[PDB]
DNA sequence: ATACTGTGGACCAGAACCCTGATAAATGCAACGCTCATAGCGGGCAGACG
């Protein structure tokens, strides 16, 4: 908590515009406190630090974040974009994205 | 009467406590490590349906 509160002063000294935390899939749920003290950390982090934050993970790492609105509303305070693999035939005709990517 | 014994008084120098400086040794405090309770995940092992 002391470092979480020290980060706010520094992030407000220089006008930080964004904060990206990448690869949350790599965290261990045994050295952190469980599946609840991670969510509490990631929800307290958004409130105190005034900058926008972005969280990136794998579909099996959403089980941490699906427990409550504290990241279903705070985390999805601006939506939740989903990445999918390319589909060959979305319509009756095959997708032009696949053809263009393969040709290039 | 006047010259000698005793004595009152003014008086210098050893000395004791205070001040100064430099070096060594005994504490006090801010910082760091030890210990105990509490919570939990995941793997390895006693009883299940097959």
UniProtKB/Swiss-Prot annotation:
Species of origin: Escherichia coli
Assembly with partners or alone: Monomer. Interacts (via C-terminus) with TnsA; this interaction allows TnsA to bind donor DNA.
Name of this protein: Transposon Tn7 transposition protein TnsC
Biological function: TnsC binds non-specifically to DNA in the presence of ATP. It is required for Tn7 transposition. TnsABC + TnsD promote high-frequency insertion of Tn7 into a specific target site known as att-Tn7 whereas TnsABC + TnsE promote low-frequency insertion into many different sites.
Lineage: Bacteria, Pseudomonadati, Pseudomonadota, Gammaproteobacteria, Enterobacterales
């Amino acid at each position: 908590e002391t470092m979480l509160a020290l980060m706010s002063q520094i992030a407000n000294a220089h006008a930080l515009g964004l904060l990206v935390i990448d690869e949350i899939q790599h965290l261990s749920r045994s050295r952190s406190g469980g599946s609840q003290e991670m969510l509490n950390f990631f929800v307290t982090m958004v409130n105190i630090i005034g900058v926008p934050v972005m969280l990136i993970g794998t579909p099996k790492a959403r089980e941490i974040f699906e427990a409550d609105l504290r990241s279903a509303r705070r985390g999805a305070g601006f939506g939740a974009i989903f990445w999918d693999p390319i589909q060959q035939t979305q319509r009756g005709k095959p997708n032009q994205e696949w053809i263009a990517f393969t040709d290039n």
